[PDB]
Amino acid sequence: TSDDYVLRIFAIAFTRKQANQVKRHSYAQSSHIRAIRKVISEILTKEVQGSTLAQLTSKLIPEVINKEIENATKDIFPLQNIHVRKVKLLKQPKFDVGALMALHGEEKGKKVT
Amino acid sequence: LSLSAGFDWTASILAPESVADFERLLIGNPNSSVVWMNYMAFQLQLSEIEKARELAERALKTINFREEAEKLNIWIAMLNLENTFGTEETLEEVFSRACQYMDSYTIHTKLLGIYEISEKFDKAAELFKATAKKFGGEKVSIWVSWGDFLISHNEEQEARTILGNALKALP
Amino acid sequence: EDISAMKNGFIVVPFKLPDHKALPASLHFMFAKRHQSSNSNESDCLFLVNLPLLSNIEHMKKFVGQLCGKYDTVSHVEELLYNDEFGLHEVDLSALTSDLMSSTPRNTALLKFVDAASINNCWNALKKYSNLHAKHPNELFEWTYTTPSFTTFVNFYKPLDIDYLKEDIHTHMAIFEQREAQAQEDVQSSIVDEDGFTLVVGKNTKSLNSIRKKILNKIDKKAKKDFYRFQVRERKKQEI
Amino acid sequence: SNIFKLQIDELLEQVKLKQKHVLKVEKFLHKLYDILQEIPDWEEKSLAEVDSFFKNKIVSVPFVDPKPIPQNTNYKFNYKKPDISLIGSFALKAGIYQPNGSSIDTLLTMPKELFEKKDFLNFRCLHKRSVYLAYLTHHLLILLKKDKLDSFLQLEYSYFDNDPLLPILRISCSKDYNFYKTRFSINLLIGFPYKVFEPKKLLPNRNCIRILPATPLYNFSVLSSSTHENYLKYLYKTKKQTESFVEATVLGRLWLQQRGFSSNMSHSGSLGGFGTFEFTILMAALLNGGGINSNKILLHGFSSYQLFKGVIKYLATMDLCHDGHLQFHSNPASKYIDEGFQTPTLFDKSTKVNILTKMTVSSYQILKEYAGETLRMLNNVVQDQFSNIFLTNISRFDNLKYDLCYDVQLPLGNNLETSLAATFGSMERVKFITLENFLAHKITNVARYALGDRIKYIQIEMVGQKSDFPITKRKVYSNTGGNHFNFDFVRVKLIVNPSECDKLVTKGPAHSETMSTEAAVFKNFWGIKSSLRRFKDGSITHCCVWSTSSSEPIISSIVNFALQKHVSKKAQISNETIKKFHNFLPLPNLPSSAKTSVLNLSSFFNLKKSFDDLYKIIFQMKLPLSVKSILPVGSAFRYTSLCQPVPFAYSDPDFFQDVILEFETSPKWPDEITSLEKAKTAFLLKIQEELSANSSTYRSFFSRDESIPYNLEIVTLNILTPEGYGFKFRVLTERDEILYLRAIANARNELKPELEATFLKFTAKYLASVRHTRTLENISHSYQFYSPVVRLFKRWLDTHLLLGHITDELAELIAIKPFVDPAPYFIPGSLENGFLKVLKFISQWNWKDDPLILDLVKPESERLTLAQYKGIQMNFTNLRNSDPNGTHLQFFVASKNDPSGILYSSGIPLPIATRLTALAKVAVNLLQTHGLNQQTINLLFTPGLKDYDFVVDLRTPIGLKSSCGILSAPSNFPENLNDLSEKMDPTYQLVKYLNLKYKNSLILSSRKYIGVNGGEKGDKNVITGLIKPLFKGAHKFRVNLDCNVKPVDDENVILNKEAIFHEIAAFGNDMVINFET
């Protein structure tokens, strides 16, 4: 991410049959799979690098990333059940208490007597 | 009291005879082709052809786009430069670039005079043909000037031929 | 003040300025010629220079009217063209991006009249008016500097009428989509030249204009070094 | 590296002394040695006899306190011929030219026969040394008279390295033997013979002043004075072994000088203790080992750079003061020991001398930090760091070098208070030889202990200390001192730690059934201010609680209490300079505002929380296109707005914070720009009406946006959140970018520059604006003092009428330069330190020839790499090639976010650019002549307004200082949203439009923030103009003049000033009051 958070994403997608499709099956040629995989990797890289970790999560909750993968891949091959399967946090920067407090939105004690 | 500083409009806080003097003049006169041309002539007299070309490009962008007459002065200032000191390709490039920016026929007219002034009559004759082919159907002036060029060079039969072609092409 | 006309020909038109408490007989000078142009919209116009701030048409309607009463002339100003006082309209960004919906100096504007009878009446009125300053500076009129367009302009922080905005969106979109549909139909309608040549149009192409702009914007590898006997003989010459 | 190698050569020759001066002095002091040999011998005398001898003489013996009294001075005095020798850097031929002047060290070794073995006790040897110097000066004076040389020689006593116990004689030449042009001064150091006293008796732990407490300072003074020639020979050998020795020494000397380091005494208070000799000696020790395993860290074959890097690295990484020390042998491989003496120690077993005894603990820490920082700069490869390392003086101002400065006036200052002086006593006298030394420690320990973790480094400086006194006086005489204390007052300079500088409570030892020793001292130190308190986690600890104030930091309060209680109850502590700067920040009109610290961003977070509520409502709303993402971009989202946001404060310029709204990609978008713009507006209408229905508590209206030239259809939804904030929404479409590129391509060639200018503003507002806020909000959490300084800086620009032309992004990027690239300084920790720094950088910035490029990353990835760095450099050189004077673009600011560099600094007129530099230079010069003081600050923040050609005074109908949320007030938005305009300042919109009319002729400037810089009622604002030189003079008329002019001749017109005044007047309406031309 832009905040130096190294993370790994997994995206999973499936082919679907058109409305008027008569064939039983909807396999895609290996060229399409490689073409789809290239597009999916690009978008995941574009979003995360152009974002912070907090901003990234704000994208996951509405699942806007999935809709963009569909809109990008709509030309290549119809797809269904596109989802961000998993996210791993490989490495973290030096801890910054200031950033954490801002994310969460100091106190004098009580005299003991 | 106050934190007051004299206003500097020459970036100094950071007749012309030198590079600095012309640059100093251009600070207040960005739209003056006379200053740019005079600055160009100094480099040409200094044998700085490559540097003079650079001043040509700076003068194009620096001058306000609405100063069409001032722009015209640079373009003729250029066409003279490559004609006198350049090569055929470099002059052709500026000639092609010049008509792209300014009225093409006017640029065609000026180069015709430049060839005449430099006594490049053969190229002037060729340019008259190319200019007449393009603008002959609309401009009578090209035929008249071309006719004058032939008559001045003692080619009377050619002048009659051009007049016949002028009548055919012209409405 | 003796000056009436500049030798380039421009008739000087002094005006008296308002009274503002901050500024306790200052004059504003406007320069005019007859404008000649073959273009019909630019015909019967009066060229103006050094206009006062925000000089819309209504300011000229009063001024010519002030002239008409004083010199009993019949003159009407049709329009004030090319009044770009801030230069916002210098480039028509709508025209550059596409031809649909848009088929298209400084400190000056063109003043259009109803007819040649009105303009030449005004020009004569201006000529007499130019002479007034040299003799009788008091009877020079007063430019108001306040008009309804001025008041709306002054009120910068004004929320827009939602309904008026709402109506504007509707009409334009209806206008655009009619043009969009027609253009798309034209491209994919089997265009054929008079010489029986059929134009190639790709699927999803929308405007024949786009086809023009596509055009305007826009053996060595298969050669073998050693295939012919003259090639190898050339190699053998170089080998030794 | 080869660039660095050449740069050393260029610097080395520049500072090289001119050999002719060496001969001239070498002519002098060789002759002078003859005069010394001319001086006669002298007989044994008692203190009474020598006093009578000198009773009538002009010379006075410079006895070191305690002066010898008749009872304790039983030992006799005598003089003999010295053993003249030359020592110091001049001996080693390592000297360099210094404009201030260098010193030649001449050593005279008094013969050993003038000693008893036990003469190193109770200042016995020192008192003998004193008269030996005095007897020489007496005869040297008359012999100087005999030679007719006294006319141009000025002789005065001085302390060696500001060591009170070691007076010396200084020879200086005022304007054939006249060496005034040489800029040299011969020093007469009277050293002891070697091994007169058993060195073991003189170790730091041992004591030689009977009263037992150790006497490190006295022991070093005598022992060092007896070991001078040996270290010369020690240095001389190493010079012979390694070829690059001298070049390494001068680099260290230059490195030391820029940081204000010297060999002078530091326990007195001044920064120093590590000079060329200490740097040189360290190199010699490290060339013979240095590791824990006794392996060589430097090799004789190293070049000058490598030698300098090794010494710099070793100081930075190895700890010599608290944990560990280094031992070497001058006459045995150097070995690093883990055990530490709690003081800087570089032991010499061969001589039993600790070379850093002049180095204080506090000074050593600052030395270590400077070394490590420069090592970081040295290891850096992307940017050349030669100039920062060597060619920048950091000691010129104390404020720029130190975060906070306090001056403490001690009481009864022609002697200190009896109670204060009584604290000195005898036991501290034996420990610290002078009261100045003792008081220096007393301030340091209480100041260090009280502030505790709140600071990094502390310096205690004796202001007004003199070290050279006339021969007719026995000791230095300070005007306020009266031969009692050689200083005018003490100054305490800190390097604060931003992370905890503003804690409300200072933690202490945890509670126990039995009071621990730490708990004891904590209780005793803080007295009544101490308190035992419980916390939410359930811990019981001793702690003292303070109160945050918006006018001063907590540190001012702590030290004020700390010094008075322990040092003296009458002490006065005053740092008004920091107080004035804090007040200059706008005070927000929030609850308990005066008690909030300037590091608190609670106002900004409250805005963000209100935004999140709106952020939720919008997504759950249904639209034809699902929303992709909403990115806030407003100033208040990145802690940069000049005034803190206040609920319902709608008069302020920065009330409405912009936010970018982006829908999912669709292929239906209109291909025509105005159609695209009005397509966007339709979506805002749908957003508006659904929001109105479901959530009526949000109040919304529509406004036009005209920032983008020629794009006149942009409409932005304004949302008034019920909590009292404003939000401005705008729609971004992926077709929008490519449409603009289409416009540029199809535009006429003459118009292409103008279209690209429009594209620059679009990418400035939509595309770039997002990446800047993201990086700037993240970084600000690392630099706590960014939001105050950038806010106060923007306050400064507006006062001088500059913010109108400088876009707010450009102000931020300049203001952050001192942080991301703090070299050679430190990261700012104070409002006054950071602000002056931004003024300093601008003062020395040559924007015509130097680009400013910033690595917007947190302190030590996204740091610029060498390829990217060079690429940006290439852009500048290409740009200046087309704009050599810089008339088109002046400031080149670039980073990872903006490689082009022209995105945030385009369109500024050159007059405004030069002014921003002209104002900066005058400010620093003002700070130079006159010290940082209340009067100086007011001049900095008050505008001249006289140089502008004409000045127009304007007053708003109603005072806006209340409606801007500024505490010297509205509580709900007006029922009719048309009423908002009635409480707004139109001046910023007034000037901007008038500038467009008179862009060819005038340049009008106005104060954007009227509430802050408009007086008490915040209703006074001023429009000021400038006539360009061309239209100032008469011109021949032409249709293209494009200006408001009046005729003078048939073909001559002049700029009609009086009309333009009326143009402004009708344009301002009731606001205009007065016109000044």
Ligand SMILES: Nc1ncnc2c1ncn2[C@@H]1O[C@H](COP(=O)(O)OP(=O)(O)OP(=O)(O)O)[C@@H](O)[C@H]1O
């Ligand atoms: N910290 C020290 N420890 C031991 N001896 C010292 C120390 N500082 C100075 N001396 C002795 O004093 C002599 C002169 O000291 P000084 O600092 O003036 O030397 P320098 O490096 O020649 O200085 P300068 O910068 O004036 O040329 C040194 O040669 C050495 O004999």
Ligand SMILES: [Mg+2]
């Ligand atoms: Mg020295």
